[PDB]
């Protein structure tokens with residue numbers, strides 16, 4: 043499973059441990075359908091969330107730095123990211139579409155905002171290459187690159203923490219760009235843990251957009 | 253399926269595992285993609301030797317453990333993990349108790365024979381258990397009645413833990429300063445870890461393991 | 471501040487970093503009415519991270535079965551007496567007869583209390599005999615019952631503390647830990663009155679603290 | 684209260700502290716000079732680190748985003764940062780000094796690298812103001828700003844986690860810029876917990892520069 047997001051981003055599922063029944067087993071402390079599904083709803087409605095910690099996902103995410111900064115505020119998870127100091131990058135940048143501004147009364151056309159963003163990114167990138175060419179190390183030269191530069195990371199997260207992430211980020215108060223990522227995370231979650239996901243939406247989900 | 257017996261009635265059972273040694277390699281490189289055994293194994297050693305531990309967080313285990321409460325209290329001090337335990341207030345229990353073997357005391361100068369210590373422990377547990385049943389029979393709820401049961405009562409739990417936190421657990425508990433009973437559990441955890449992540453385990457022993465027992469035992 | 475709990479337990483405040491204004495400063499990243507209004511605003515909209523910048527240290531004396539529940543709260547720091555090495559006072563929680571009032575028992579509540587006292591005395595005497603004969607503490611203590619009192623230090627931030635109160639200052643929690651949670655709430659209220667009142671009004675999910683002053 | 688200036692416009696300021704060296708001693712003994720100092724050394728040399736969690740600091744930090752991204756990887760701590768979406772910013776940028784490049788054979792003089800960095804940040808900043816003036820919301824407009832933009836945050840952290848931070852960041856493998864911040868954090872730590880700090884350097888500190 044891989045879902046494209048924004049202009050060059052994506053969320054890709056790398057691995058998953060367990061499924062809905064992993065939470066049921068943990069709740070019953072028992073290794074060895076209607077009753078199991080009823081238990082999942084029960085746990086969710088009463089806030090008995092610890093059993094959901096025994097379901098774990100690993101994702102591979104490509105996102106602009108400003109999105110990644112918000113995402114990385116979720117401390118109850120594991121992250122490994124490309125190195126700005128040492129890694130080869132593709133040097134791609136998130137350029138908002140004109141539709142992103144639709145809704146706001148701007149004194150220049152949305153298409154022109156897009157163009158100005160693209161221009162300043164190109165200038166920053168060209169300054170960066172000149173610095174590199176003249177022998178400035180990457181860890182210094184890259185500081186002139188803008189916040190819409192794409193990075194990549196691995197994210198390992200359990201279903202309880204993932205639900206918190208969806209509560210906060212799959213919500214209209216979150217920035218639109220990370221909402222888009224959160225929708226994709228939700229889709230993958232739903233595919234792998236349909237009972238947990240449905241119970242979550244029904245009883246515990248605090249956001250609006252799902 | 254891996255299940256190892258511990259103490260007189262305890263066990264550690266593997267329930268599930270996400271990933272393997274290559275999960276750490278992929279996370280370190282940030283590449284979901286190009287396998288090369290010698291370079292991959294070299295990267296695991298490199299990470300371990302230089303203390304780059306975050307890639308090991310992407311390997312995760314779930315165990316099912318049966319252990320006496322005094323062991324579980326030590327275990328549950330490891331906060332970077334997930335636990336679900338039987339309820340003392342509401343769950344059915346089997347009411348089994350850890351009775352140390354006479355060999356457990358061999359090593360200490362005692363004024364009574366080790367066999368007699370074992371017997372006295374068995375006796376007081378039986379008395380406690382019988383008092384407990386009398387309380388239950390007379391209508392005292394379990395959450396109150398169970399407080400007279402001793403600390404060697406067995407409980408069960410699920411434990412989900414990543415390999416980084418697992419290595420911390422082994423550093424601290426697979427060690428002669430840890431209580432002998434929890435050492436026995438830690439050796440079983442190590443055996444399972446070794447079986448599932450042999451490269452990580454070997455690199456851990458070689459570069460990062462701070463304890464004493466796992467360099468001797470196998 | 472030290473509050474007695476159960477028959478021999480307590481909660482004592484050791485230290486506190488900050489006060490209500492610590493959360494205000496952290497939220498603003500740098501007039502009492504506007505500051506109090508901000509605390510209510512944060513609490514009402516679920517902006518909880520600023521409350522992480524208020525921290526408490528408590529010293530708690532509680533029976534092991536209560537401590538086991540308490541220590542499930544992972545987002546906190548604990549240091550407890552060593553069962554293997556520490557000197558203990560060997561005291562035990564004996565429920566009062568009133569603790570059983572509410573349950574139809576076939577023996578009088580006073581008799582339940584007595585039977586508990588008896589079995590703890592027997593366990594404790596067996597323990598002393600084991601110790602006297604040279605059995606090390608780390609082994610001998612395993613015969614002691616779960617109502618043995620222990621002590622610990624607990625360092626915890628106000629956000630995690632509010633989670634603790636949501637779960638433990640609540641009628642679904644065991645009565646014994648409810649009593650501890652009420653004392654924690656009293657101390658919290660004394661040190662962070664605005665946070666506490668906003669918590670009760672907008673975020674508290676339990677039942678007992680809306681009833682009990 | 685203590686404030687140390689870092690880089691060209693950054694700082695680390697101590698906001699508050701709970702406890703001191705004796706807080707760790709009290710927690711280790713569970714009880715409310717030579718023997719106390721000896722206990723701190725003992726704990727440190729044997730890796731008995733949990734008592735140090737009962738010492739807690741709050742800092743106020745002003746640092747460039749690229750430094751903040753490294754810092755915020757330390758999950759065992761609490762953070763509150765200025766909002767890129769909603770907060771007023773001062774719009775200041777870290778411009779490396781010519782001495783920062785000394786050590787590297789560059790084909791342009793270090794002073795010219797500094798100038799080029801200043802230029803591209805000015806251009807990015809001016810593009811940003813134009814976008815703002817034309818009604819583009821801040822959460823979109825700010826994505827063109829470079830990674831050397833200064834941000835501010837509150838950081839609450841216990842001494843155990845602070846020692847892990849110093850092991851990793853007060854070290855020559857860490858980027859030079861965050862080394863400077865780590866040195867200031869270490870200064871403050873030393874001032875408030877001298878026995879802990881000395882024991883840490885003696886027995887546990889894994890880095891080189893302290």
Ligand SMILES: Cc1cc2nc3c(=O)[nH]c(=O)nc-3n(C[C@H](O)[C@H](O)[C@H](O)COP(=O)(O)OP(=O)(O)OC[C@H]3O[C@@H](n4cnc5c(N)ncnc54)[C@H](O)[C@@H]3O)c2cc1C
Pocket residue numbers: 115116117118119203206210211215216217519522545627629630759760761762763764765766767
């Ligand atoms: C719409 C929106 C606007 C935002 N604006 C800002 C802003 O302007 N500035 C800013 O700095 N941040 C901002 N954030 C980030 C926000 O403050 C949180 O950092 C982020 O939402 C992660 O939430 P969390 O702490 O619940 O998640 P995690 O860090 O994954 O924590 C998960 C859960 O564990 C608990 N937890 C984890 N660590 C601790 C701890 N140390 N103490 C107590 N409990 C803990 C809490 O229960 C938490 O819910 C914003 C977030 C959103 C959604």
Ligand SMILES: Cc1cc2nc3c(=O)[nH]c(=O)nc-3n(C[C@H](O)[C@H](O)[C@H](O)COP(=O)(O)OP(=O)(O)OC[C@H]3O[C@@H](n4cnc5c(N)ncnc54)[C@H](O)[C@@H]3O)c2cc1C
Pocket residue numbers: 329330331332333417420424425429430431545546547548549550551552553733736759841843844847
């Ligand atoms: C031989 C031995 C004797 C012991 N004796 C006692 C005793 O007498 N009394 C007692 O109370 N305990 C005792 N313990 C328990 C010990 O203090 C730790 O609670 C236990 O070893 C868990 O270790 P941890 O904190 O490293 O693991 P975890 O809690 O799993 O944490 C793992 C890592 O995450 C970090 N971490 C997690 N949470 C925090 C935080 N809040 N702040 C900073 N860093 C954090 C640390 O880097 C830590 O190493 C003993 C342990 C051993 C092995």
Ligand SMILES: Cc1cc2nc3c(=O)[nH]c(=O)nc-3n(C[C@H](O)[C@H](O)[C@H](O)COP(=O)(O)OP(=O)(O)OC[C@H]3O[C@@H](n4cnc5c(N)ncnc54)[C@H](O)[C@@H]3O)c2cc1C
Pocket residue numbers: 092095118200202203332333334335336337338339340542543544545546630633637638642643644
């Ligand atoms: C009435 C009652 C009955 C109970 N019965 C049982 C029982 O039968 N068996 C049993 O085992 N336990 C039982 N518990 C304990 C319960 O399962 C929790 O362990 C305990 O309430 C601590 O809650 P917490 O996880 O929110 O707290 P903390 O562990 O302090 O965590 C605080 C917050 O941080 C986040 N967090 C911390 N660590 C993680 C993680 N690893 N993954 C995801 N999120 C995390 C969550 O947002 C959490 O709310 C019971 C608790 C109560 C109150």
Ligand SMILES: Cc1cc2nc3c(=O)[nH]c(=O)nc-3n(C[C@H](O)[C@H](O)[C@H](O)COP(=O)(O)OP(=O)(O)OC[C@H]3O[C@@H](n4cnc5c(N)ncnc54)[C@H](O)[C@@H]3O)c2cc1C
Pocket residue numbers: 118119120121122123124125126306309332414416417756757758759760844847851852856857858
């Ligand atoms: C020189 C240098 C280069 C780096 N390069 C990169 C890079 O290229 N890419 C990249 O992504 N990162 C990089 N990092 C960041 C690094 O991987 C860590 O994210 C960062 O150093 C924080 O370390 P920490 O995990 O020990 O701290 P914290 O996250 O504060 O954790 C403190 C301690 O708690 C424990 N802990 C906390 N959470 C968990 C958990 N979920 N599981 C297990 N244990 C836990 C560990 O014991 C840990 O030491 C680099 C760091 C340095 C110093």
Ligand SMILES: O=c1ccn([C@H]2C[C@H](O)[C@@H](CO)O2)c(=O)[nH]1
Pocket residue numbers: 111112113115215216217764765766767768
């Ligand atoms: O919607 C938001 C706004 C801000 N931040 C955090 C991320 C970063 O640390 C800082 C940026 O202002 O605050 C978020 O996580 N989400």
Ligand SMILES: O=c1ccn([C@H]2C[C@H](O)[C@@H](CO)O2)c(=O)[nH]1
Pocket residue numbers: 123124125126127752753754756856857858
């Ligand atoms: O020295 C470094 C290099 C990288 N990173 C992390 C921070 C950020 O998330 C990403 C930048 O490459 O990796 C660090 O924390 N420290």
Ligand SMILES: O=c1ccn([C@H]2C[C@H](O)[C@@H](CO)O2)c(=O)[nH]1
Pocket residue numbers: 337338339340341538539540542642643644
């Ligand atoms: O009300 C309860 C019941 C159980 N537990 C946890 C504590 C211990 O780990 C185990 C005992 O059943 O479950 C609690 O935390 N609170």
Ligand SMILES: O=c1ccn([C@H]2C[C@H](O)[C@@H](CO)O2)c(=O)[nH]1
Pocket residue numbers: 325326327329429430431550551552553554
């Ligand atoms: O070897 C030990 C000794 C003590 N403790 C912790 C467990 C419990 O909370 C308390 C009991 O002494 O201290 C351990 O974890 N390991």
